[PDB]
Design a protein around this ligand. Structure first.
Ligand code: 39V
Ligand code: MG
Ligand code: MG
Ligand code: MG
Ligand code: MG
Lengths: 195, 222, 226, 204, 233, 196, 211, 195, 196
């Protein structure tokens, strides 16, 4: 798929993901949710080749849910991101690699800190205050570099995110049909229904 | 580089009647601009009142027919000499063809017989197994020459009743075996004139409740 | 295509089949492959049909003008030289393969010419997809000092070989005999061994069968007076 | 990609008793997309009719070219061009573009005004003439047309019978071709009257 | 997938009233080089079958060994190995046809064209073709490679259809085959003058003729041919 | 193709086979590859038949026009004209020509002009696809100042072996003898040369 | 192909065309592009004929086994997933199969789009095939949740007609289905030639075409 | 460029043309006017390869303006469309063809009729009631086939055009930044400033 | 490379040049291409040196193991093992091998195994890039039942011409004589054979 954004503020992580799905010359859907909940306080958005994205995300989801049941314990965002990276690094040298780029937004309940991890299909992991995949960063990173503070509130994070989407909507040739925004904090994961 | 496929030409034709069916095909076998044989049978009686033809690359066609004939033999062994119905044969052939989905039998297959209500039946396949029951079907080299003629003369397409001027269609009256054989012979004579891979001989297999009968007719040898 | 050329006692004969194809489809069942360059110089062409016609008409036109300029009857070597120099210049892009034969004040002549501009001499030749089938007949039955009747037989037998055994060739046999001291006789459809049999049925429709939306008279005449 | 099958279309011509018929479909497309259902492919210069299939820009270009050439012919010769002569003109004009050809399949149809003899002819894109007695076919459903014409045709048909035969050949051939159809026209031509009929057909 | 290296050219054959005839030259070509001049490409199997093979010689020698092994294997626990349960032409062909089609299906073909000629138990003539693609066909006359283009037209003038077979004698059939071999020598650049010929008759059995030569050739007319158009001397 | 030109005491002899192929089909089995460009200057042609015929025709024209103005040309002069055509049009030609001629002053001379358009004057020359198989034979058996009969035997035996091994070569063996006496054509059929 | 399917108040409508092509040649004029998996499950077909038939016929085998093991009909969501999982096995091997799995289960009416990439999408409206753009035009401007069974069937029918007209690789006839909680209901085969002229007159549409 | 539409109603021709211009991954302009006035009652919109479109349009404009001055007379829309077609047919066999597709909307003052001509870069001309180039027709022609009448008013033509643009905006993957709409009638050419 | 094996009255002789090239560079000018697989069964190698060495090593192993079990193998048996390796691995090999050996029963025998893996028993055989130039010479000069000295001269003269014309061939001429008397190695240097 097309655009996925992420931003880590004071006390939460916000992920924004486009709604469009295109096959051939036709937009089949304009309300697609490019994300899976891995655990109560860990959300993963994804983008890449058709089919592979959902299959990979669901496969990761199943593995983390299996870990949660076995140990009666939620893995840290760092642990989950490392697990995901290894799977992608394992995948890139396979017969047919999974062409999937992800952002992992999680709230670490132990450290009481939000955490955002950016991982591409090669298995390239980086922890960031804000991130994106594909061409999204080309348009948005200049705004984020300018406006971002680490002590920002969730509401300020959403406003800076709105500015990023507006810039994308102005200067991108593709119509990505807006974004679904989700917030990850100490209380869990919730969706912003009006954006 | 080695090419595992080839083209042996030929053309086949199946027509379903009310209580009979015909499967016809020319007897010429070719490669490029040469004639291999003027009489090389292409339509086969496979048992259980079923006739079959796999037209295109002869090696793949002979292999398929051989395998289907074998499937009929084992159907009898495994299911107490039960008769293989034409619909059951068709589905079986689908799986034979799709089993080689990634290295296809390069043939157009057609089978003909009688359904379980005694009515005439023709089934048509593509090289990778997609099939359907049909009333009329020409396959092979001159398939595009023959099919429109059959749309016109078998299903009375674009034909209306005089005086009404396009308001009322020609009614779909059934065809006798004598009438069908005329359309088959005229179809092949016409195809022989305008297609270089069609000629030499015509062999028709007619299926009725009484069994399978054969008719042979000469074609132009040029 | 099957075409042949055979020399005999007092002249030369050429022949050809009458099938023209587009791919595996027969476009024309009675094509005329025997072309006239001059009255007593005839050629037959295989390969790109438009090129064999265009190159034949061009050289035939220049040969006619040459004949008028010199007050002499055209020679086969002139047609040959003019053809090969034209074909060579275009480096095989004009796909004309011809058998050229004729009689002139020098004698009787038989040549073949290929698209790149090479020419050959012979007593018997064959060109086209049916050349091998025809040459098998020629190599089996040709001899020195053939009569006119023997050469026509050999030529038409060689064409028939191509008709029956080559899919690119078919239908009828055309012949042209060029004898010294005589007019050339063009025998269109010399043999007709491939007549279509009567159809089992007539497909003449009832009048009114086809649906019509609009009728109108087409004005083909010029603008009228008054 | 293949210029001869981008726009689609078909033309067929037949001879009868003291008459000729030429017909064509009306479709113009851009591959799968149908663009026009009024793109007629038959033109006439005096009493000589010309049908052209293939790349539509060349169809239009050639019509304008032969209109140009037949108008000059008429001014100089002081008479209308005949079918036999026009056939050679078409052949000449196509071969002059031997190494940059018009991607077309022309068909000539008409009756010689002096001899009264019915005449049809076909060409390839490069000029080679096919002077058939019976019928000529051209277009994206040429294979289909050969099959229909070869079976339906019989010699010495009367004008009103010939109409049914050519119409049924065209219609049923077009209905087995994705790139042909969207309407059809048939010209019935006699020595001094020409009738033009639009056929009703399926619009898919 | 391979390419053929050392190759044999045409194999030609036909049916006649009481049996079948088959022939093939003794050349093993290495491209345009006429490298080996003593190669036998007709291989008898018992006294009722001759297999003629064209194409890659290394694969021919492999097939030759398969047939030799087939005869050995048929004799095992078979008291009627030289009688009712002897190898038929139809058994030998079907075996080869199975092998050829299997090998092409594994994309590793035996690069050959094969004609199995013989006479069955009931006296019936057997003549069938198979090649590297597993394609099979039968005809009153059969030929491979150049033979298909040049021999078949000549042989079909003798036996044009099935009904011409009883009317064709062994002398007429052999004559047609020998003439065909001469024509191929005139016109096939990878042919040799030396050839072998085999006759399988239902009465007289198997006659295998070696060291045959093309004779009665016409070359004299060459002396008169001068230049390529205008040259007189 | 198998072609050769050999100088001897009384002049020079050109030799050639008669086979022309289109792949493995023999399009002409009685070809005349020994072509005249002047009375006593001939050439042997190898490569593209279209190219070699077109060249030899042009050379014949040049030497005919040379003769009209300046008298009988030398064999060297003929070779130069061949060379000039072959060299300047090397990109569009595939021609391997042997030039052989007789003067009264220079006697028999042989020039070979391979693919690139270079010229090489030699006692004898061999060319064509079949020449590869007789380099060893011809080197061991050639002598200078042979007799006419010895030279004819040398060419006959040589081309015999070339024909024997090269499938692109065959048919009859044609020869042309160039001496003060005049121009003699020879021909040798399969039954004669195969049994050598 | 042109196929479509959409959810509405009274179930789901499914409509397909009937053409089959081999280049410019129209190979079949009346192929059945809908499969009756069970009395409450339908599947549309677009792409490789062969593929569509094999894998959706196999889906029906696998959906039948679900009923035998669990004693309960399979959901539309689960059925669509089984199919999407079959596609993921032959991932990259060159299959071509676009389909809508339509039906009625415990959650109400269901509709899932599935393609050869293993894509599985839930939604109220879908259209696949070479002529899907033409169908979407009519659907988008006329669709409502409050459609009547009669008006909905016509919309699906008219939408295919639009595609059959313009798309060269769509046509032949229209096959209609209506899925209810008592099962699917076939609403016949409708020739496009006859339907076009009928719709032209009654609706006043296709003014540019002459009839 | 991307999308150009045309529709001929009772007494006018309406042309709608996208505003976007894209270089690389960036939309450089969202207010571009892809049209030139050839004469007071003849308007030509265009779409194709970058640069060629404007150069071709201006070259046509200059030639028609030259004709108008020389003869003190406005060429009919049919005459202009034929001139344009010949130039494109001439161009397609040139060393480097002009890759330009056009719609010509004109009002014939002699016949008192609106006329719309569709011409592609090959020189393929067709007179139509409504037309488009590229992929535009794939989305819009089904709507036009359904709703179009020849006796429509200009206001009804604009409403049907709005429906076409809405469908494009829904099902096209590309963001073409809306359209500039112009009307050609007996009084001349005017732009609809609110659309 | 220029290699050959010739049968004569008392047995068989193998001959070869000594040049190995990497393009136009002579990587080794004193190569030993005459390789032993058994006491009196030797082979001449042409093609890929890696492939031919690997094959000959495997054959030597098979015949050593054959000998341990069944006694002295025939020359035919040796050739069959070469063939089996060359034929079954024809896709991955580029080997042209001549096999030559002496039995007391069968005397001197020569088998050639070209690229495809076919086997051909012959009176004498030639192979390698340089063989093309001596087909004519060798055919004209070979006789059956020659003497040892006549056979050595035949091989010497033949390879001399092959070396003379083939740039891929050169160096010394090595020979191996296989008779009832035993195994004799010979060598002939440039100054000897060039002047022939
Ligand atoms: C549209 C017509 C566009 O193709 C539609 O997608 C149909 C779908 C369809 C589904 C089920 C049954 C029939 C049709 N597609 C086809 O017709 C495909 C198009 C196609 C060709 N190559 C290709 C395609 C699609 C994707 C990749 C590659 N056509 C076919 O698959 C051809 C091979 N089918 C036939 O020729 C058939 C014949 C003949 C035949 C069939 C199919 C079925 C029953 C009897 C005969
Ligand atoms: Mg990264
Ligand atoms: Mg024929
Ligand atoms: Mg359509
Ligand atoms: Mg050296």
């Amino acid at each position: 798929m097309d655009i996925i954004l992420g931003i880590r503020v004071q006390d939460s992580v916000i992920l924004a993901s486009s709604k469009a799905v295109t096959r051939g010359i036709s937009v089949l859907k304009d309300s697609d949710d490019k994300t899976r909940q891995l655990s109560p306080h860990t959300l993963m958005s994804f983008a890449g080749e058709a089919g592979d994205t959902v299959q990979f995300a669901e496969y990761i989801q199943a593995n983390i849910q299996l870990y949660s049941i076995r140990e009666d314990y939620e893995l840290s965002p760092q642990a989950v991101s490392s697990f995901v990276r290894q799977e992608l690094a394992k995948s890139i040298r396979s017969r047919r690699p999974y062409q999937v780029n992800v952002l992992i937004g999680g709230y670490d309940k132990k450290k009481n800190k939000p955490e955002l991890y950016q991982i591409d299909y090669l298995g390239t992991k980086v922890e960031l205050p804000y991130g994106a995949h594909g061409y999204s960063g080309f348009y948005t990173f200049s705004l984020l570099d300018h406006h971002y503070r680490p002590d920002m509130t969730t509401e300020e994070g959403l406003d800076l995110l709105k500015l990023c989407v507006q810039e994308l909507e102005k200067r991108m040739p593709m119509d990505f049909k807006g974004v679904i925004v989700k917030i990850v904090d100490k209380d869990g994961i919730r969706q912003v229904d009006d954006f | 580089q080695f090419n595992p496929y080839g083209d042996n030409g030929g053309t086949i034709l199946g027509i379903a009647g009310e209580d009979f069916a015909v499967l016809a095909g020319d007897t010429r076998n070719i490669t490029d601009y040469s004639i291999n044989s003027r009489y090389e049978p292409k339509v086969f009686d496979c048992g259980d009142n079923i006739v079959m033809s796999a037209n295109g690359f002869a090696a793949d066609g002979d292999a398929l027919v051989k395998r289907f004939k074998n499937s009929v033999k084992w159907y009898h062994f495994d299911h107490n000499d039960k008769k293989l119905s034409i619909n059951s044969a068709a589905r079986n052939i689908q799986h034979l063809l799709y089993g080689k989905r990634f290295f296809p039998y390069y043939v157009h297959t057609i089978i003909a017989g009688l359904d379980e209500d005694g009515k005439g039946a023709v089934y048509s396949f593509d090289p990778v197994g997609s099939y359907e029951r049909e009333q009329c079907r020409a396959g092979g080299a001159a398939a595009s020459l023959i099919m429109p003629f059959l749309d016109n003369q078998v299903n009375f397409k674009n034909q209306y009743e005089p005086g009404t001027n396009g308001k009322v269609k020609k009614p779909l009256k059934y065809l006798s075996v004598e009438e069908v054989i005329k359309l088959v012979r005229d179809s092949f004579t016409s195809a022989t004139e305008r297609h270089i891979q069609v000629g030499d001989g015509l062999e028709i297999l007619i299926v009725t409740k009484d069994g399978v009968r054969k008719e042979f007719y000469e074609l132009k040898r040029d | 295509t099957t075409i042949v050329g055979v020399k005999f006692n007092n002249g030369v004969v050429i022949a050809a089949d009458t099938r023209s194809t587009q791919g595996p489809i027969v476009a024309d069942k009675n094509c005329a492959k025997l072309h006239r360059i001059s009255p007593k110089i005839w050629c037959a062409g295989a390969g790109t049909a438009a090129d064999t016609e265009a190159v034949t008409q061009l050289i035939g036109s220049n040969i006619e003008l040459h004949s008028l300029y010199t007050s002499r009857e055209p020679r086969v070597v002139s047609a040959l030289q003019m053809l090969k120099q034209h074909l060579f210049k275009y480096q095989g892009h004009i796909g004309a393969y011809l058998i050229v034969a004729g009689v002139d004040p020098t004698g009787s002549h038989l040549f073949s010419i290929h698209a790149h501009g090479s020419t050959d001499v012979g007593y018997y030749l064959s060109l086209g997809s049916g050349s091998l089938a025809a040459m098998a007949v020629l190599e089996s039955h040709w001899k020195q000092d053939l009569t006119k009747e023997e050469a026509i037989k050999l030529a038409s037998d060689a064409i028939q070989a191509g008709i029956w055994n080559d899919l690119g060739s078919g239908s009828n046999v055309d012949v042209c005999v060029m004898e010294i001291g005589k007019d050339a006789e063009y025998l269109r459809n010399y043999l007709t061994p491939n007549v279509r049999e009567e159809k089992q049925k007539s497909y003449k429709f009832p009048r009114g069968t086809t649906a019509v939306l609009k009728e109108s008279i087409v004005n083909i005449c010029d603008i009228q007076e008054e | 990609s293949d210029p001869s099958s981008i726009n689609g279309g078909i033309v067929v011509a037949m001879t009868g008793k003291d008459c000729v018929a030429i017909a064509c479909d009306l479709r113009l497309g851009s591959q799968s997309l149908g663009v026009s259902n009024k793109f007629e492919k038959i033109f006439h210069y005096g009493h000589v009719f010309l049908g052209i299939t293939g790349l539509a820009t060349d169809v239009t270009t050639l019509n304008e070219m032969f209109r140009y050439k037949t108008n000059l012919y008429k001014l100089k010769e002081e008479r209308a061009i005949e079918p036999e002569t026009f056939t050679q003109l078409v052949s000449s004009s196509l071969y002059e573009r031997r190494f940059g050809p018009y991607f077309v399949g022309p068909v000539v149809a008409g009756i010689n005004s002096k001899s009264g003899k019915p005449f049809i002819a076909g060409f390839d894109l490069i000029g080679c003439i096919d002077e058939a007695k019976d019928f000529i076919v051209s277009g994206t459903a040429s294979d289909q047309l050969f099959g229909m014409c070869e079976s339906l045709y019989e010699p010495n048909l009367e004008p009103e019978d010939l109409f049914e035969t050519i119409s049924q050949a065209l219609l049923n051939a077009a209905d087995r071709d994705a790139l042909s159809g969207w309407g059809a026209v048939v010209y019935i031509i006699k020595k001094d009257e020409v009738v033009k009929r639009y056929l009703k057909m399926r619009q898919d | 997938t391979q390419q053929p290296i050392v190759t044999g050219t045409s194999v030609i054959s036909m049916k006649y009233d009481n049996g079948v005839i088959i022939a093939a030259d003794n050349l093993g070509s290495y491209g345009s080089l006429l490298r080996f001049n003593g190669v036998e490409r007709l291989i008898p199997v018992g006294d009722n079958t001759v297999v003629g093979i064209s194409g890659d010689i290394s694969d021919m020698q492999h097939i030759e060994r398969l047939l030799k092994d087939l005869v050995t294997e048929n004799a095992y626990d078979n008291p009627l190995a030289d009688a009712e349960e002897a190898l038929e032409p139809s058994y030998i062909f079907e075996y080869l046809a199975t092998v050829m089609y299997q090998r092409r299906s594994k994309m590793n073909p035996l690069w050959n064209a094969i004609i199995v000629a013989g006479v069955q138990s009931n006296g019936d003539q057997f003549l069938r073709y198979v090649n590297l693609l597993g394609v099979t066909y039968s005809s009153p006359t059969l030929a491979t490679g150049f033979g298909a283009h040049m021999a078949n037209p000549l042989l079909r003038k003798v036996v044009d259809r099935e009904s011409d077979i009883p009317k064709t004698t062994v002398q007429v059939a052999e004559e047609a085959i020998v003439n065909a071999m001469r024509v191929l020598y005139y016109r096939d650049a990878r042919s040799s003058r030396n050839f072998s010929l085999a006759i399988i008759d239902k009465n007289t059995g198997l006659t295998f003729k070696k060291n045959l030569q093309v004779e009665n050739m016409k070359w004299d007319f060459a002396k008169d041919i001068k230049g390529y158009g205008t040259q007189k001397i | 193709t198998s072609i050769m030109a050999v100088t001897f005491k009384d002049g020079v002899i050109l030799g050639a086979d008669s086979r022309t192929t289109t792949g493995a089909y023999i399009a002409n089995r009685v070809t005349d590859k020994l072509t005249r460009v002047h009375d006593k200057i001939w050439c042997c042609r190898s490569g593209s038949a279209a190219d070699t015929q077109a060249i030899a025709d042009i050379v014949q024209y040049h030497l005919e026009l040379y003769t009209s103005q300046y008298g009988t040309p030398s064999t060297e002069t003929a070779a130069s004209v061949f060379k000039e055509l072959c060299y300047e049009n090397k990109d569009n030609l595939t021609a391997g020509i042997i030039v052989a001629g007789y003067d009264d002053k220079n006697k028999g001379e042989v020039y070979t002009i391979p693919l690139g358009g270079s010229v090489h004057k030699l006692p004898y020359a061999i060319a064509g696809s079949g020449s590869t198989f007789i380099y060893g034979y011809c080197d061991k058996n050639f002598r200078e100042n042979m007799s006419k009969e010895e030279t004819v035997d040398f060419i006959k035996h040589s081309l015999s072996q070339a024909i024997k091994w090269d499938g692109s070569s065959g048919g009859v063996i044609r020869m042309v003898v160039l001496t003060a006496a005049g121009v003699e054509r020879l021909i040798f059929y399969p039954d004669e040369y195969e049994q050598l | 192909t042109t196929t479509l399917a959409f959810k509405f108040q009274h179930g789901v409508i499914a409509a397909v065309d009937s053409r089959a092509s081999a280049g410019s040649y129209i190979s079949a004029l009346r192929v059945n592009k809908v499969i009756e998996i069970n009395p409450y499950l339908l599947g549309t077909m677009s792409g490789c004929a062969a593929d569509c038939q094999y894998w959706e016929t196999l889906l029906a085998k696998e959906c039948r086994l679900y009923y035998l093991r669990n004693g309960e009909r399979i959901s539309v969501s689960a059925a669509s997933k089984l199919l999407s999982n079959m596609m993921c096995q032959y991932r990259g091997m060159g299959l071509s199969m676009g389909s809508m799995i339509c039906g009625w289960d415990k959650k109400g009416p269901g509709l899932y789009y599935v393609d050869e990439h293993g894509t599985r999408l839930s939604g109220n409206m879908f259209s696949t095939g070479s002529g899907n753009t033409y169908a979407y035009g009519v659907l988008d401007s006329n669709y409502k949740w409050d459609l009547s069974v009669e008006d909905a069937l016509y919309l699906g029918k008219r939408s295919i007609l639009a595609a059959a007209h313009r798309d060269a690789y769509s046509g032949g006839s229209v096959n209609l289905y209506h899925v209810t909680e008592d099962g699917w209901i076939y609403h016949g085969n409708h020739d496009v030639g006859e339907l076009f002229w009928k719709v032209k007159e009654e609706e006043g549409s296709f003014n540019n075409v002459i009839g």
